[PDB]
mmCIF file with all atom_site columns, C-alpha atoms in Angstrom:
data_model
loop_
_atom_site.group_PDB
_atom_site.id
_atom_site.type_symbol
_atom_site.label_atom_id
_atom_site.label_alt_id
_atom_site.label_comp_id
_atom_site.label_asym_id
_atom_site.label_entity_id
_atom_site.label_seq_id
_atom_site.pdbx_PDB_ins_code
_atom_site.Cartn_x
_atom_site.Cartn_y
_atom_site.Cartn_z
_atom_site.occupancy
_atom_site.B_iso_or_equiv
_atom_site.pdbx_formal_charge
_atom_site.auth_seq_id
_atom_site.auth_comp_id
_atom_site.auth_asym_id
_atom_site.auth_atom_id
_atom_site.pdbx_PDB_model_num
ATOM 1   C CA . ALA N 1 1   ? 3.719   -70.308 -46.143 1.00 35.25 ? 1   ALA N CA 1
ATOM 2   C CA . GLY N 1 2   ? 3.964   -66.684 -44.907 1.00 35.72 ? 2   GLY N CA 1
ATOM 3   C CA . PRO N 1 3   ? 6.397   -63.819 -45.465 1.00 35.59 ? 3   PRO N CA 1
ATOM 4   C CA . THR N 1 4   ? 10.222  -63.955 -45.337 1.00 37.59 ? 4   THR N CA 1
ATOM 5   C CA . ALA N 1 5   ? 11.627  -63.879 -41.818 1.00 38.01 ? 5   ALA N CA 1
ATOM 6   C CA . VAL N 1 6   ? 12.599  -60.722 -39.941 1.00 39.85 ? 6   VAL N CA 1
ATOM 7   C CA . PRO N 1 7   ? 16.111  -61.549 -38.645 1.00 39.60 ? 7   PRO N CA 1
ATOM 8   C CA . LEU N 1 8   ? 16.486  -60.086 -35.139 1.00 38.69 ? 8   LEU N CA 1
ATOM 9   C CA . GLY N 1 9   ? 20.292  -60.357 -35.149 1.00 39.53 ? 9   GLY N CA 1
ATOM 10  C CA . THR N 1 10  ? 21.634  -59.831 -31.618 1.00 41.03 ? 10  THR N CA 1
ATOM 11  C CA . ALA N 1 11  ? 18.234  -58.470 -30.522 1.00 42.01 ? 11  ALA N CA 1
ATOM 12  C CA . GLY N 1 12  ? 17.365  -62.253 -30.544 1.00 41.97 ? 12  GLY N CA 1
ATOM 13  C CA . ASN N 1 13  ? 19.692  -62.609 -27.476 1.00 46.00 ? 13  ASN N CA 1
ATOM 14  C CA . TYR N 1 14  ? 17.126  -60.839 -25.185 1.00 48.30 ? 14  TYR N CA 1
ATOM 15  C CA . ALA N 1 15  ? 13.738  -61.704 -23.681 1.00 49.69 ? 15  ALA N CA 1
ATOM 16  C CA . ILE N 1 16  ? 13.407  -57.903 -23.181 1.00 47.78 ? 16  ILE N CA 1
ATOM 17  C CA . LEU N 1 17  ? 15.412  -55.192 -24.941 1.00 46.15 ? 17  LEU N CA 1
ATOM 18  C CA . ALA N 1 18  ? 14.364  -51.551 -24.355 1.00 44.37 ? 18  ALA N CA 1
ATOM 19  C CA . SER N 1 19  ? 15.850  -48.070 -24.843 1.00 47.71 ? 19  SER N CA 1
ATOM 20  C CA . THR N 1 20  ? 14.284  -45.755 -22.187 1.00 47.50 ? 20  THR N CA 1
ATOM 21  C CA . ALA N 1 21  ? 13.115  -47.914 -19.242 1.00 45.57 ? 21  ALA N CA 1
ATOM 22  C CA . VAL N 1 22  ? 12.130  -51.379 -18.006 1.00 48.34 ? 22  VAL N CA 1
ATOM 23  C CA . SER N 1 23  ? 9.930   -51.472 -14.860 1.00 48.45 ? 23  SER N CA 1
ATOM 24  C CA . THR N 1 24  ? 8.604   -54.527 -12.964 1.00 47.40 ? 24  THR N CA 1
ATOM 25  C CA . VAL N 1 25  ? 6.072   -54.903 -10.101 1.00 44.15 ? 25  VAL N CA 1
ATOM 26  C CA . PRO N 1 26  ? 7.339   -58.093 -8.373  1.00 43.85 ? 26  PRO N CA 1
ATOM 27  C CA . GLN N 1 27  ? 7.201   -60.954 -8.929  1.00 45.40 ? 27  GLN N CA 1
ATOM 28  C CA . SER N 1 28  ? 7.762   -61.108 -12.737 1.00 47.25 ? 28  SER N CA 1
ATOM 29  C CA . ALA N 1 29  ? 9.171   -64.346 -14.188 1.00 48.00 ? 29  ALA N CA 1
ATOM 30  C CA . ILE N 1 30  ? 11.456  -63.553 -17.160 1.00 51.77 ? 30  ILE N CA 1
ATOM 31  C CA . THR N 1 31  ? 13.349  -66.319 -18.952 1.00 51.40 ? 31  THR N CA 1
ATOM 32  C CA . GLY N 1 32  ? 16.140  -64.655 -20.911 1.00 47.34 ? 32  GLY N CA 1
ATOM 33  C CA . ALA N 1 33  ? 18.272  -61.532 -20.823 1.00 46.00 ? 33  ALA N CA 1
ATOM 34  C CA . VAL N 1 34  ? 17.000  -58.030 -20.177 1.00 46.07 ? 34  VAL N CA 1
ATOM 35  C CA . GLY N 1 35  ? 18.975  -55.211 -21.849 1.00 47.01 ? 35  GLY N CA 1
ATOM 36  C CA . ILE N 1 36  ? 18.517  -51.450 -21.752 1.00 48.49 ? 36  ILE N CA 1
ATOM 37  C CA . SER N 1 37  ? 20.339  -48.896 -23.926 1.00 49.22 ? 37  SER N CA 1
ATOM 38  C CA . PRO N 1 38  ? 21.104  -46.150 -24.286 1.00 48.75 ? 38  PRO N CA 1
ATOM 39  C CA . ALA N 1 39  ? 19.479  -45.541 -20.850 1.00 53.50 ? 39  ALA N CA 1
ATOM 40  C CA . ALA N 1 40  ? 21.487  -46.591 -17.723 1.00 52.50 ? 40  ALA N CA 1
ATOM 41  C CA . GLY N 1 41  ? 20.665  -49.445 -15.315 1.00 50.41 ? 41  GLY N CA 1
ATOM 42  C CA . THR N 1 42  ? 18.973  -46.947 -12.957 1.00 49.85 ? 42  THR N CA 1
ATOM 43  C CA . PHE N 1 43  ? 16.116  -47.093 -15.544 1.00 50.38 ? 43  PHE N CA 1
ATOM 44  C CA . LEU N 1 44  ? 15.679  -50.835 -14.739 1.00 46.47 ? 44  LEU N CA 1
ATOM 45  C CA . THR N 1 45  ? 13.293  -50.482 -11.764 1.00 48.89 ? 45  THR N CA 1
ATOM 46  C CA . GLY N 1 46  ? 11.599  -53.004 -9.409  1.00 49.74 ? 46  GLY N CA 1
ATOM 47  C CA . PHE N 1 47  ? 14.184  -55.751 -10.144 1.00 49.78 ? 47  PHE N CA 1
ATOM 48  C CA . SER N 1 48  ? 16.049  -55.499 -6.753  1.00 48.48 ? 48  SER N CA 1
ATOM 49  C CA . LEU N 1 49  ? 19.236  -55.787 -8.849  1.00 48.70 ? 49  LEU N CA 1
ATOM 50  C CA . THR N 1 50  ? 22.497  -57.334 -7.677  1.00 49.01 ? 50  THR N CA 1
ATOM 51  C CA . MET N 1 51  ? 25.561  -56.155 -9.656  1.00 50.93 ? 51  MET N CA 1
ATOM 52  C CA . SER N 1 52  ? 27.754  -59.216 -10.365 1.00 48.96 ? 52  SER N CA 1
ATOM 53  C CA . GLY N 1 53  ? 31.502  -59.386 -9.665  1.00 48.68 ? 53  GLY N CA 1
ATOM 54  C CA . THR N 1 54  ? 32.770  -58.078 -13.053 1.00 47.65 ? 54  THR N CA 1
ATOM 55  C CA . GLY N 1 55  ? 30.419  -55.006 -12.923 1.00 54.48 ? 55  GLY N CA 1
ATOM 56  C CA . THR N 1 56  ? 29.293  -55.872 -16.522 1.00 52.34 ? 56  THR N CA 1
ATOM 57  C CA . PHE N 1 57  ? 25.853  -57.410 -15.691 1.00 54.69 ? 57  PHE N CA 1
ATOM 58  C CA . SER N 1 58  ? 23.359  -57.600 -12.833 1.00 49.03 ? 58  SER N CA 1
ATOM 59  C CA . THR N 1 59  ? 20.870  -60.207 -11.596 1.00 47.30 ? 59  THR N CA 1
ATOM 60  C CA . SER N 1 60  ? 17.310  -60.255 -10.307 1.00 47.92 ? 60  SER N CA 1
ATOM 61  C CA . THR N 1 61  ? 15.289  -63.080 -8.746  1.00 46.88 ? 61  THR N CA 1
ATOM 62  C CA . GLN N 1 62  ? 12.653  -62.031 -11.379 1.00 45.78 ? 62  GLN N CA 1
ATOM 63  C CA . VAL N 1 63  ? 15.100  -62.970 -14.267 1.00 49.15 ? 63  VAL N CA 1
ATOM 64  C CA . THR N 1 64  ? 16.631  -66.278 -15.375 1.00 52.11 ? 64  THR N CA 1
ATOM 65  C CA . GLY N 1 65  ? 19.503  -64.644 -17.273 1.00 51.94 ? 65  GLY N CA 1
ATOM 66  C CA . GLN N 1 66  ? 21.558  -61.445 -17.051 1.00 53.66 ? 66  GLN N CA 1
ATOM 67  C CA . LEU N 1 67  ? 20.455  -57.848 -16.972 1.00 55.26 ? 67  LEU N CA 1
ATOM 68  C CA . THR N 1 68  ? 22.637  -55.331 -18.787 1.00 55.10 ? 68  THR N CA 1
ATOM 69  C CA . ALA N 1 69  ? 22.551  -51.545 -19.175 1.00 56.58 ? 69  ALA N CA 1
ATOM 70  C CA . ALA N 1 70  ? 24.390  -48.862 -21.191 1.00 52.10 ? 70  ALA N CA 1
ATOM 71  C CA . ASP N 1 71  ? 26.373  -47.654 -18.079 1.00 52.56 ? 71  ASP N CA 1
ATOM 72  C CA . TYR N 1 72  ? 27.688  -51.165 -17.129 1.00 54.82 ? 72  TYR N CA 1
ATOM 73  C CA . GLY N 1 73  ? 31.357  -52.133 -17.498 1.00 53.77 ? 73  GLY N CA 1
ATOM 74  C CA . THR N 1 74  ? 33.115  -52.725 -20.851 1.00 55.62 ? 74  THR N CA 1
ATOM 75  C CA . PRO N 1 75  ? 32.142  -54.532 -23.008 1.00 51.88 ? 75  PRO N CA 1
ATOM 76  C CA . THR N 1 76  ? 28.401  -54.361 -22.050 1.00 54.39 ? 76  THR N CA 1
ATOM 77  C CA . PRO N 1 77  ? 27.824  -50.863 -23.568 1.00 56.12 ? 77  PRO N CA 1
ATOM 78  C CA . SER N 1 78  ? 29.204  -51.995 -26.969 1.00 53.30 ? 78  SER N CA 1
ATOM 79  C CA . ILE N 1 79  ? 27.155  -55.235 -26.830 1.00 54.99 ? 79  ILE N CA 1
ATOM 80  C CA . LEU N 1 80  ? 23.970  -53.248 -26.191 1.00 54.55 ? 80  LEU N CA 1
ATOM 81  C CA . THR N 1 81  ? 24.621  -50.649 -28.922 1.00 52.90 ? 81  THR N CA 1
ATOM 82  C CA . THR N 1 82  ? 24.808  -53.523 -31.427 1.00 53.55 ? 82  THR N CA 1
ATOM 83  C CA . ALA N 1 83  ? 21.606  -55.163 -29.999 1.00 50.00 ? 83  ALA N CA 1
ATOM 84  C CA . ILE N 1 84  ? 19.695  -51.822 -30.170 1.00 49.06 ? 84  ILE N CA 1
ATOM 85  C CA . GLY N 1 85  ? 20.949  -51.397 -33.800 1.00 52.08 ? 85  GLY N CA 1
ATOM 86  C CA . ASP N 1 86  ? 19.789  -54.943 -34.666 1.00 50.23 ? 86  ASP N CA 1
ATOM 87  C CA . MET N 1 87  ? 16.367  -54.232 -33.056 1.00 48.63 ? 87  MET N CA 1
ATOM 88  C CA . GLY N 1 88  ? 16.055  -51.037 -35.180 1.00 43.92 ? 88  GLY N CA 1
ATOM 89  C CA . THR N 1 89  ? 17.005  -52.917 -38.384 1.00 47.42 ? 89  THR N CA 1
ATOM 90  C CA . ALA N 1 90  ? 14.459  -55.655 -37.504 1.00 45.32 ? 90  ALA N CA 1
ATOM 91  C CA . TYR N 1 91  ? 11.608  -53.193 -36.768 1.00 47.03 ? 91  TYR N CA 1
ATOM 92  C CA . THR N 1 92  ? 12.238  -51.275 -40.063 1.00 45.80 ? 92  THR N CA 1
ATOM 93  C CA . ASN N 1 93  ? 12.521  -54.566 -42.046 1.00 47.83 ? 93  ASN N CA 1
ATOM 94  C CA . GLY N 1 94  ? 9.099   -55.677 -40.680 1.00 46.09 ? 94  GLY N CA 1
ATOM 95  C CA . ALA N 1 95  ? 7.401   -52.287 -40.892 1.00 45.00 ? 95  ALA N CA 1
ATOM 96  C CA . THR N 1 96  ? 8.412   -51.651 -44.548 1.00 45.56 ? 96  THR N CA 1
ATOM 97  C CA . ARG N 1 97  ? 7.492   -55.142 -46.008 1.00 48.33 ? 97  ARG N CA 1
ATOM 98  C CA . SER N 1 98  ? 5.194   -54.577 -49.081 1.00 50.39 ? 98  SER N CA 1
ATOM 99  C CA . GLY N 1 99  ? 2.335   -56.601 -50.590 1.00 48.83 ? 99  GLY N CA 1
ATOM 100 C CA . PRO N 1 100 ? 0.271   -57.748 -47.575 1.00 48.00 ? 100 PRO N CA 1
ATOM 101 C CA . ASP N 1 101 ? -1.753  -61.009 -47.785 1.00 48.20 ? 101 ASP N CA 1
ATOM 102 C CA . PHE N 1 102 ? -4.404  -59.362 -45.520 1.00 48.14 ? 102 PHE N CA 1
ATOM 103 C CA . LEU N 1 103 ? -5.303  -55.657 -45.452 1.00 47.74 ? 103 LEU N CA 1
ATOM 104 C CA . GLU N 1 104 ? -7.494  -54.248 -42.590 1.00 50.63 ? 104 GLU N CA 1
ATOM 105 C CA . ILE N 1 105 ? -8.646  -57.851 -41.941 1.00 52.65 ? 105 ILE N CA 1
ATOM 106 C CA . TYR N 1 106 ? -11.659 -57.845 -39.494 1.00 53.04 ? 106 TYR N CA 1
ATOM 107 C CA . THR N 1 107 ? -10.994 -54.111 -38.837 1.00 53.71 ? 107 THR N CA 1
ATOM 108 C CA . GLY N 1 108 ? -8.182  -55.257 -36.505 1.00 51.55 ? 108 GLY N CA 1
ATOM 109 C CA . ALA N 1 109 ? -10.605 -57.143 -34.180 1.00 53.38 ? 109 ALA N CA 1
ATOM 110 C CA . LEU N 1 110 ? -8.818  -60.506 -33.821 1.00 54.65 ? 110 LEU N CA 1
ATOM 111 C CA . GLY N 1 111 ? -11.096 -62.060 -31.139 1.00 56.32 ? 111 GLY N CA 1
ATOM 112 C CA . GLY N 1 112 ? -12.340 -65.552 -32.133 1.00 57.24 ? 112 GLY N CA 1
ATOM 113 C CA . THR N 1 113 ? -10.219 -65.633 -35.319 1.00 57.07 ? 113 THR N CA 1
ATOM 114 C CA . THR N 1 114 ? -7.882  -68.292 -36.642 1.00 57.43 ? 114 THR N CA 1
ATOM 115 C CA . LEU N 1 115 ? -5.021  -66.468 -38.448 1.00 59.57 ? 115 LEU N CA 1
ATOM 116 C CA . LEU N 1 116 ? -3.314  -68.252 -41.330 1.00 61.10 ? 116 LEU N CA 1
ATOM 117 C CA . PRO N 1 117 ? 0.300   -67.571 -42.348 1.00 56.28 ? 117 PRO N CA 1
ATOM 118 C CA . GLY N 1 118 ? 0.841   -64.214 -44.042 1.00 56.65 ? 118 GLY N CA 1
ATOM 119 C CA . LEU N 1 119 ? 1.839   -60.560 -43.996 1.00 56.37 ? 119 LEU N CA 1
ATOM 120 C CA . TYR N 1 120 ? -0.992  -58.626 -42.316 1.00 52.82 ? 120 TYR N CA 1
ATOM 121 C CA . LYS N 1 121 ? -1.230  -54.820 -42.596 1.00 51.15 ? 121 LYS N CA 1
ATOM 122 C CA . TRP N 1 122 ? -3.573  -52.660 -40.546 1.00 55.95 ? 122 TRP N CA 1
ATOM 123 C CA . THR N 1 123 ? -3.531  -48.853 -40.918 1.00 57.19 ? 123 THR N CA 1
ATOM 124 C CA . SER N 1 124 ? -5.335  -49.096 -37.558 1.00 57.68 ? 124 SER N CA 1
ATOM 125 C CA . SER N 1 125 ? -5.122  -50.180 -33.933 1.00 58.98 ? 125 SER N CA 1
ATOM 126 C CA . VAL N 1 126 ? -5.416  -53.971 -33.467 1.00 59.49 ? 126 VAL N CA 1
ATOM 127 C CA . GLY N 1 127 ? -6.978  -55.755 -30.457 1.00 55.48 ? 127 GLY N CA 1
ATOM 128 C CA . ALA N 1 128 ? -8.527  -59.020 -29.320 1.00 55.35 ? 128 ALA N CA 1
ATOM 129 C CA . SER N 1 129 ? -11.514 -59.005 -26.914 1.00 56.99 ? 129 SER N CA 1
ATOM 130 C CA . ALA N 1 130 ? -11.595 -62.854 -27.048 1.00 58.50 ? 130 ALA N CA 1
ATOM 131 C CA . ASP N 1 131 ? -9.100  -65.740 -27.427 1.00 58.81 ? 131 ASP N CA 1
ATOM 132 C CA . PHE N 1 132 ? -7.732  -66.276 -30.936 1.00 63.80 ? 132 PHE N CA 1
ATOM 133 C CA . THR N 1 133 ? -5.518  -68.809 -32.666 1.00 64.14 ? 133 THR N CA 1
ATOM 134 C CA . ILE N 1 134 ? -2.518  -68.497 -34.969 1.00 61.22 ? 134 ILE N CA 1
ATOM 135 C CA . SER N 1 135 ? -2.578  -71.683 -37.071 1.00 60.31 ? 135 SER N CA 1
ATOM 136 C CA . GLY N 1 136 ? 0.144   -73.089 -39.324 1.00 61.21 ? 136 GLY N CA 1
ATOM 137 C CA . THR N 1 137 ? 3.136   -75.453 -39.462 1.00 59.93 ? 137 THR N CA 1
ATOM 138 C CA . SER N 1 138 ? 6.390   -75.147 -37.464 1.00 60.90 ? 138 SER N CA 1
ATOM 139 C CA . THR N 1 139 ? 7.986   -73.460 -40.549 1.00 57.73 ? 139 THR N CA 1
ATOM 140 C CA . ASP N 1 140 ? 5.114   -70.999 -41.422 1.00 54.91 ? 140 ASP N CA 1
ATOM 141 C CA . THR N 1 141 ? 5.527   -67.233 -40.695 1.00 55.68 ? 141 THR N CA 1
ATOM 142 C CA . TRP N 1 142 ? 3.285   -64.350 -39.669 1.00 55.18 ? 142 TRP N CA 1
ATOM 143 C CA . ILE N 1 143 ? 4.142   -60.647 -39.782 1.00 57.50 ? 143 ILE N CA 1
ATOM 144 C CA . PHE N 1 144 ? 1.515   -58.389 -38.201 1.00 56.40 ? 144 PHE N CA 1
ATOM 145 C CA . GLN N 1 145 ? 2.164   -54.782 -39.330 1.00 56.54 ? 145 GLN N CA 1
ATOM 146 C CA . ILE N 1 146 ? 0.223   -52.529 -36.956 1.00 55.53 ? 146 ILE N CA 1
ATOM 147 C CA . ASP N 1 147 ? 0.197   -48.724 -37.521 1.00 53.75 ? 147 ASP N CA 1
ATOM 148 C CA . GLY N 1 148 ? -1.808  -48.117 -34.323 1.00 47.96 ? 148 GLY N CA 1
ATOM 149 C CA . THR N 1 149 ? -1.811  -49.626 -30.839 1.00 43.51 ? 149 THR N CA 1
ATOM 150 C CA . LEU N 1 150 ? -1.877  -53.410 -30.115 1.00 46.35 ? 150 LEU N CA 1
ATOM 151 C CA . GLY N 1 151 ? -3.939  -54.809 -27.247 1.00 48.98 ? 151 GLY N CA 1
ATOM 152 C CA . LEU N 1 152 ? -4.948  -58.166 -25.835 1.00 51.93 ? 152 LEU N CA 1
ATOM 153 C CA . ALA N 1 153 ? -7.919  -58.032 -23.425 1.00 49.56 ? 153 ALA N CA 1
ATOM 154 C CA . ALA N 1 154 ? -7.767  -59.094 -19.737 1.00 50.13 ? 154 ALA N CA 1
ATOM 155 C CA . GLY N 1 155 ? -7.577  -62.907 -19.365 1.00 49.09 ? 155 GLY N CA 1
ATOM 156 C CA . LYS N 1 156 ? -7.594  -63.523 -23.186 1.00 50.20 ? 156 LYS N CA 1
ATOM 157 C CA . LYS N 1 157 ? -5.096  -65.873 -24.810 1.00 53.64 ? 157 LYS N CA 1
ATOM 158 C CA . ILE N 1 158 ? -3.392  -66.532 -28.147 1.00 56.73 ? 158 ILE N CA 1
ATOM 159 C CA . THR N 1 159 ? -3.340  -70.252 -28.968 1.00 58.78 ? 159 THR N CA 1
ATOM 160 C CA . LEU N 1 160 ? -0.838  -71.804 -31.386 1.00 59.73 ? 160 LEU N CA 1
ATOM 161 C CA . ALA N 1 161 ? -2.398  -74.506 -33.578 1.00 64.51 ? 161 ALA N CA 1
ATOM 162 C CA . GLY N 1 162 ? -0.839  -76.772 -36.266 1.00 66.78 ? 162 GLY N CA 1
ATOM 163 C CA . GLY N 1 163 ? 2.749   -76.501 -34.911 1.00 63.80 ? 163 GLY N CA 1
ATOM 164 C CA . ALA N 1 164 ? 2.993   -72.656 -35.259 1.00 63.73 ? 164 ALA N CA 1
ATOM 165 C CA . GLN N 1 165 ? 6.019   -71.301 -33.305 1.00 62.64 ? 165 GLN N CA 1
ATOM 166 C CA . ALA N 1 166 ? 6.095   -68.013 -31.361 1.00 62.09 ? 166 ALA N CA 1
ATOM 167 C CA . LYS N 1 167 ? 9.566   -67.272 -32.795 1.00 61.27 ? 167 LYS N CA 1
ATOM 168 C CA . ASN N 1 168 ? 7.953   -67.291 -36.297 1.00 62.51 ? 168 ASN N CA 1
ATOM 169 C CA . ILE N 1 169 ? 5.327   -64.704 -35.328 1.00 63.48 ? 169 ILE N CA 1
ATOM 170 C CA . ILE N 1 170 ? 6.400   -61.042 -35.547 1.00 62.55 ? 170 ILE N CA 1
ATOM 171 C CA . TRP N 1 171 ? 4.231   -58.197 -34.279 1.00 63.06 ? 171 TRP N CA 1
ATOM 172 C CA . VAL N 1 172 ? 5.614   -54.945 -35.750 1.00 64.34 ? 172 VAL N CA 1
ATOM 173 C CA . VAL N 1 173 ? 3.727   -52.261 -33.797 1.00 64.73 ? 173 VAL N CA 1
ATOM 174 C CA . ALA N 1 174 ? 4.149   -48.470 -34.223 1.00 63.32 ? 174 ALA N CA 1
ATOM 175 C CA . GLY N 1 175 ? 1.652   -47.615 -31.417 1.00 60.48 ? 175 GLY N CA 1
ATOM 176 C CA . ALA N 1 176 ? 1.779   -48.604 -27.731 1.00 63.39 ? 176 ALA N CA 1
ATOM 177 C CA . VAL N 1 177 ? 1.367   -52.314 -26.913 1.00 60.01 ? 177 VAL N CA 1
ATOM 178 C CA . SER N 1 178 ? -0.913  -53.097 -23.918 1.00 61.19 ? 178 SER N CA 1
ATOM 179 C CA . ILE N 1 179 ? -1.272  -56.774 -22.822 1.00 61.09 ? 179 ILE N CA 1
ATOM 180 C CA . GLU N 1 180 ? -3.999  -56.683 -20.165 1.00 60.17 ? 180 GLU N CA 1
ATOM 181 C CA . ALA N 1 181 ? -3.990  -58.473 -16.773 1.00 63.71 ? 181 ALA N CA 1
ATOM 182 C CA . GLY N 1 182 ? -3.870  -62.321 -16.998 1.00 64.92 ? 182 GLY N CA 1
ATOM 183 C CA . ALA N 1 183 ? -3.695  -62.286 -20.848 1.00 66.63 ? 183 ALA N CA 1
ATOM 184 C CA . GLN N 1 184 ? -1.360  -64.796 -22.648 1.00 66.15 ? 184 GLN N CA 1
ATOM 185 C CA . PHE N 1 185 ? 0.471   -63.503 -25.726 1.00 67.84 ? 185 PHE N CA 1
ATOM 186 C CA . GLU N 1 186 ? 2.454   -65.370 -28.395 1.00 66.93 ? 186 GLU N CA 1
ATOM 187 C CA . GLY N 1 187 ? 5.088   -63.800 -30.668 1.00 66.96 ? 187 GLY N CA 1
ATOM 188 C CA . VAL N 1 188 ? 8.013   -61.471 -30.944 1.00 68.00 ? 188 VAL N CA 1
ATOM 189 C CA . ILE N 1 189 ? 7.009   -57.835 -30.454 1.00 70.53 ? 189 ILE N CA 1
ATOM 190 C CA . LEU N 1 190 ? 9.021   -55.256 -32.369 1.00 69.20 ? 190 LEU N CA 1
ATOM 191 C CA . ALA N 1 191 ? 7.571   -52.156 -30.758 1.00 68.97 ? 191 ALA N CA 1
ATOM 192 C CA . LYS N 1 192 ? 8.380   -48.598 -31.928 1.00 72.20 ? 192 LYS N CA 1
ATOM 193 C CA . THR N 1 193 ? 7.210   -47.212 -28.547 1.00 72.70 ? 193 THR N CA 1
ATOM 194 C CA . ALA N 1 194 ? 6.053   -48.629 -25.208 1.00 70.49 ? 194 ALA N CA 1
ATOM 195 C CA . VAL N 1 195 ? 5.027   -52.167 -24.286 1.00 72.99 ? 195 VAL N CA 1
ATOM 196 C CA . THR N 1 196 ? 3.076   -52.971 -21.137 1.00 73.78 ? 196 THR N CA 1
ATOM 197 C CA . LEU N 1 197 ? 2.231   -56.388 -19.649 1.00 75.37 ? 197 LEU N CA 1
ATOM 198 C CA . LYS N 1 198 ? -0.243  -56.001 -16.768 1.00 74.13 ? 198 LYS N CA 1
ATOM 199 C CA . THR N 1 199 ? -0.697  -58.096 -13.585 1.00 71.93 ? 199 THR N CA 1
ATOM 200 C CA . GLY N 1 200 ? -0.191  -61.840 -14.128 1.00 70.07 ? 200 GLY N CA 1
ATOM 201 C CA . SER N 1 201 ? -0.023  -61.595 -17.951 1.00 70.35 ? 201 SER N CA 1
ATOM 202 C CA . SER N 1 202 ? 2.371   -63.798 -19.917 1.00 70.11 ? 202 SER N CA 1
ATOM 203 C CA . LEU N 1 203 ? 4.209   -63.637 -23.249 1.00 71.14 ? 203 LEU N CA 1
ATOM 204 C CA . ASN N 1 204 ? 6.054   -66.367 -25.143 1.00 73.05 ? 204 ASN N CA 1
ATOM 205 C CA . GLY N 1 205 ? 8.335   -64.533 -27.609 1.00 69.63 ? 205 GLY N CA 1
ATOM 206 C CA . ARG N 1 206 ? 10.375  -61.423 -26.953 1.00 67.98 ? 206 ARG N CA 1
ATOM 207 C CA . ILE N 1 207 ? 9.727   -57.771 -26.157 1.00 63.37 ? 207 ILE N CA 1
ATOM 208 C CA . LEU N 1 208 ? 11.941  -55.541 -28.348 1.00 61.24 ? 208 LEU N CA 1
ATOM 209 C CA . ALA N 1 209 ? 10.775  -52.009 -27.576 1.00 61.72 ? 209 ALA N CA 1
ATOM 210 C CA . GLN N 1 210 ? 12.447  -48.798 -28.837 1.00 61.82 ? 210 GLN N CA 1
ATOM 211 C CA . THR N 1 211 ? 11.129  -46.934 -25.765 1.00 62.62 ? 211 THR N CA 1
ATOM 212 C CA . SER N 1 212 ? 9.854   -48.506 -22.530 1.00 60.12 ? 212 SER N CA 1
ATOM 213 C CA . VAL N 1 213 ? 8.716   -51.878 -21.191 1.00 63.21 ? 213 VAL N CA 1
ATOM 214 C CA . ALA N 1 214 ? 6.456   -52.041 -18.137 1.00 63.88 ? 214 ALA N CA 1
ATOM 215 C CA . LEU N 1 215 ? 5.756   -55.384 -16.407 1.00 65.04 ? 215 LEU N CA 1
ATOM 216 C CA . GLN N 1 216 ? 3.289   -56.073 -13.578 1.00 65.93 ? 216 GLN N CA 1
ATOM 217 C CA . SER N 1 217 ? 4.061   -59.536 -12.068 1.00 67.25 ? 217 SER N CA 1
ATOM 218 C CA . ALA N 1 218 ? 4.311   -60.696 -15.705 1.00 69.47 ? 218 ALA N CA 1
ATOM 219 C CA . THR N 1 219 ? 5.844   -63.791 -17.301 1.00 67.14 ? 219 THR N CA 1
ATOM 220 C CA . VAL N 1 220 ? 8.144   -63.279 -20.328 1.00 71.48 ? 220 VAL N CA 1
ATOM 221 C CA . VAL N 1 221 ? 9.531   -66.521 -21.778 1.00 67.50 ? 221 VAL N CA 1
ATOM 222 C CA . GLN N 1 222 ? 11.992  -66.038 -24.628 1.00 70.05 ? 222 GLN N CA 1
ATOM 223 C CA . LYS N 1 223 ? 11.147  -67.963 -27.830 1.00 68.04 ? 223 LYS N CA 1
#
């Protein structure tokens, strides 16, 4: 049940892929790669980077995986151009899907809900002021098309019920994404603009932002 998948292509190789900046207030805990392009590695800030021997990737104690930037040694720039391309394809694929199963459902107030598999369209901002559940089997899909901003309120959490997988949940957000302090998010975020994860928040999924990503001692676990 649910809509056809949004293939991420090589964007699915990153916990965080951004185009303009990635910032962190230590100590973030990222499991997976962090890539930035076409901005240079100087737009990865707060990571206390160490450039590795080849000059093609760097490391941070805040990242289990490699960081890469557009200015790093061949072949890292080419890798990242293809990843950024694949992110753009993915975002457009998800944003342009027709025939939603849910239209303006709950006026975009997801607190206390249990969301069944489907394509969801809101011509609005979406938010949750209370915990909510995404409920379906390990093979069910969700696409959340959001024309406005996406938020998740401080300390609030998204629960997976029924065997639902984060990698099967796609948030396609045109507006800014703000995950408030201590909140726990589930899903892949295909963001047209900025994404922010505030102090002690967590996300199981990926952050694929066409502008900036801002972390504040945040946990990002690739799914």
